[PDB]
């Protein structure tokens, strides 16, 4: 019942106790593995009254556990209150520690993040009491501030009011925070960011009016209460930016690329106690391969390795002759020597997964576990170099949880 | 029932039936997944009679399938005759054409291997009259003859007897039919292959006579009917090498390194309608990055990132300066180009994964499904920049199959 899984470079072996917690489905069956199926049914998310009290219930459980005081009047007295509660609103609210709580262990739980040695210290910025589109671009913006933090960035989320009967709802329906504009072309090609290009005509189908370049920051666009979304754009001076040098290659600069500073995901639901956060945007700071290998190089996002093994003077015809392999790593080098040199926080791929097997220990001993889904904490280049890759990873869903949830231009009741 | 599986760079649905036909289990349950435990529980293999009919039926019952003929009289009469020899033997014989079969689908259906769009072409080598560690070696060494053929490589397996009651079960000793020796230092360190050092010392236990350097080839260790196995030494002229020069460093020939062309897994279990053979090597050639990345760069075997980044003139101190990418991009171009200039048949990762997402087409069109191990399909570098990262893959179970098993030192009633 107790699992072992072991690291084939290092023949450390632990046990995991903590996946008999574990309450949420993975998708996988005795007769089949989905562990590299992308959105899995179930890591997706209309909840009734007489299934809260036990989600409830087993939350106030193990944050009680938590402060030590488990089974105490006050444990005891806050599962009647909510309870009462319950009955009386079929829903509820959290206690500010409660949130903070839930928010951190959300992602302490997200089994896909390779960052989570940093879980406890996370800031928790309450916006329950927000009420338009307006307030949540104000709370957005004072989130954007402090997490930037003149480029020394600080985790931190942001967590607008609780899903209530459905139709009411809070959704930042940006999928980042900051993301570059997607512009298609006369010729059928892309300037811009590809992904995004969906989201740019429904910004422009709202009133945005394109600058029609290539990192043109989008807009917020923001549905309050389950309104029709309002656009806002953040104020420039806080979106930090990061221009793209090489510390050998002076013909860089003329690449002319750059990254903004703040990977800030705002489309997830955050899940406690049974409770449903809609709009939750949380924030830290980049691992270089997110930029240098997925963002420039995936080939429907930016894909410059054509031209970067170009200017390298590269034999670019056959293909074993490792040319993007190359090129790639010149890329990486050059996001990371660009962050650095300007005191913003940026992560390489060797020191994060270290940190996460260091990570790993400190959950096996003080936790009995920790859940984590190897497809995606192994770095998307040089896999093998890195510890993570000879390290099993026991994947299952604790909750509290960050969860992935339908785009609301799919799903909303429209005017 | 009837899943999908997606591509996010191309956008490719394709939908996987064959999982229905299905029949062992993977070690995740509904609430864990296991995708990168690396020898489950499941993973490898005491079998009586009365449970090998059933998998001696559902066997030919395919068998008759694929050759058009599916309940035909030869196939009601083939069910009846070994039905009948299995109340006789309590076991059973392999016609010449089911050995063929049952092998290759067992490749076929190997859901680790990233070559398989080349799993009809294979050269089955019936051993099964084999009777002694001599006759093994001798069926060996034609094996590595034909399948190295002077560099143009060739898939090929040799099938020696299949195990009967246990305590004779014909077992090549060695992991891999050519591997390289492994000798502990005087002061605790490796000299070469790490790996293999505890093989090396049976080796010497039973009288290999070490020449105590780098790249020396190991001895067969054949263990025959269940006796006590015998050293034999491949003719060095049969054992096909290619020495690792770079297309632009003239100082790599100094590192001196060399590889050999064939890999031959030698100490996996066949398993074909029930029956088990023990020993059943096969070969195929090499993907460039399981010897220029995880043969030569891995920490726990030939660990030459150090002395490859010092002639390179790299940043070594900090490990944001990208060494360990930069010196295992060079590395692997190095292999590729060496093997290329001799016409040893080898596969860069690029060419190879292309070849996988293009054979998963066919199987999904012809077959309506091809099980897929993520964790090991994907190439241990540029991960990302190969088609397979954003394939989602089914993993499932189909036999005949491939079979991890015991090590022999571990199980075998010696004297
Ligand atoms: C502090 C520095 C952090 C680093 C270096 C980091 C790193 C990463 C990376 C590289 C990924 C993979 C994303 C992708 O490749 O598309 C990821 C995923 C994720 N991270 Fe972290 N992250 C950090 C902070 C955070 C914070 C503050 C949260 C939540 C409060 C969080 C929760 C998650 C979640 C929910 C996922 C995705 C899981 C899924 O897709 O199902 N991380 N992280
Ligand atoms: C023809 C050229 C071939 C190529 C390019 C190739 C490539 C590969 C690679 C790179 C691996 C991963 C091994 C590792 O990383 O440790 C692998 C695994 C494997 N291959 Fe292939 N291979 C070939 C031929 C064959 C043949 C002839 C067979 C069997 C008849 C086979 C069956 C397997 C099996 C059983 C595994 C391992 C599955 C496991 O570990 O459970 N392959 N292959
Ligand atoms: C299909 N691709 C989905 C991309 C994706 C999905 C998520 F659900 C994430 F959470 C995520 O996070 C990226 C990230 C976030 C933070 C806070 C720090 C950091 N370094 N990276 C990225
Ligand atoms: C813990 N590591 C286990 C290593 C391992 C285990 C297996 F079960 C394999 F089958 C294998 O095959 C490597 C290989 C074989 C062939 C025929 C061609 C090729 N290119 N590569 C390697
Ligand atoms: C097909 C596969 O599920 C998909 O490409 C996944 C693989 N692993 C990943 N890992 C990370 N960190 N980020 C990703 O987007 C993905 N994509
Ligand atoms: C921990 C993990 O299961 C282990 O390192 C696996 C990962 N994927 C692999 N993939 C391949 N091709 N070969 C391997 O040896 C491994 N090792
Ligand atoms: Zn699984």
Redesign the pocket.
């Known amino acids: 019942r107790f699992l072992k899984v072991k690291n ?1 470079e290092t023949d450390v072996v632990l046990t995991d106790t903590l996946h008999l917690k574990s309450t949420l489905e993975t998708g996988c069956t005795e007769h089949i593995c989905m562990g590299s199926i992308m959105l899995p049914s179930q890591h997706t998310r209309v909840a009734t009254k007489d299934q809260l009290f036990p989600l409830a219930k087993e939350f106030l459980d193990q944050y009680y556990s938590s402060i030590k005081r488990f089974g105490s009047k006050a444990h005891m007295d806050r599962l009647e209150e909510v309870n009462k509660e319950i009955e009386s609103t079929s829903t509820y609210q959290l206690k500010d520690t409660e949130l903070i709580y839930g928010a951190k262990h959300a992602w302490r739980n997200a089994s896909r993040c390779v960052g989570r040695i940093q879980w406890s210290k996370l800031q928790v910025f309450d916006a329950r009491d927000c009420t338009t589109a307006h307030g949540m671009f104000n709370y957005i913006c004072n989130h954007v501030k402090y997490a930037t933090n003149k480029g020394n960035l600080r985790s931190a989320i942001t967590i607008f009011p609780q899903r209530t009967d459905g139709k009411h709802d809070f959704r930042v329906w940006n999928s980042q925070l900051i993301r570059y504009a997607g512009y298609k072309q006369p010729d059928g090609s892309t300037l811009g960011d590809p992904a995004n290009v969906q989201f740019t005509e429904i910004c422009i189908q709202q009133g945005w009016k394109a600058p029609r370049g290539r990192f043109d920051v989008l807009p917020l666009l923001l549905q309050a209460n389950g309104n029709d979304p309002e656009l806002f754009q953040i104020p420039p001076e806080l979106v930090l930016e990061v221009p793209i040098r090489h510390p050998k290659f002076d013909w860089f600069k003329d690449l002319g690329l750059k990254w903004y500073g703040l990977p800030a995901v705002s489309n997830m639901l955050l899940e406690i106690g049974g409770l449903e956060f809609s709009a939750c945007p949380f924030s830290g700071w980049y691992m270089g391969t997110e930029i240098g290998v997925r963002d420039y190089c995936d080939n429907s996002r930016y894909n410059i390795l054509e031209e970067v093994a170009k200017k390298m003077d590269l034999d670019m015809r056959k293909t074993s002759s490792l040319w993007k392999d190359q090129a790639l790593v010149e890329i990486n080098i050059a996001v990371l020597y660009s962050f650095q040199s300007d005191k913003v926080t940026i992560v390489d791929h060797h020191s994060a997964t270290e940190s996460f097997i260091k990570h790993m220990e400190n959950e096996y001993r003080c936790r009995g576990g920790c859940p984590a889904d ?1 497809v995606w904490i192994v770095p998307p280049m040089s896999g ?1 170099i890195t510890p993570v ?5 026991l994947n299952y869903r604790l909750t509290p949880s960050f969860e992935y949830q339908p785009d609301p231009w799919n799903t909303h009741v429209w005017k």
């Open positions: 084939w190897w093998s890759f000879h390290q099993e990873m």
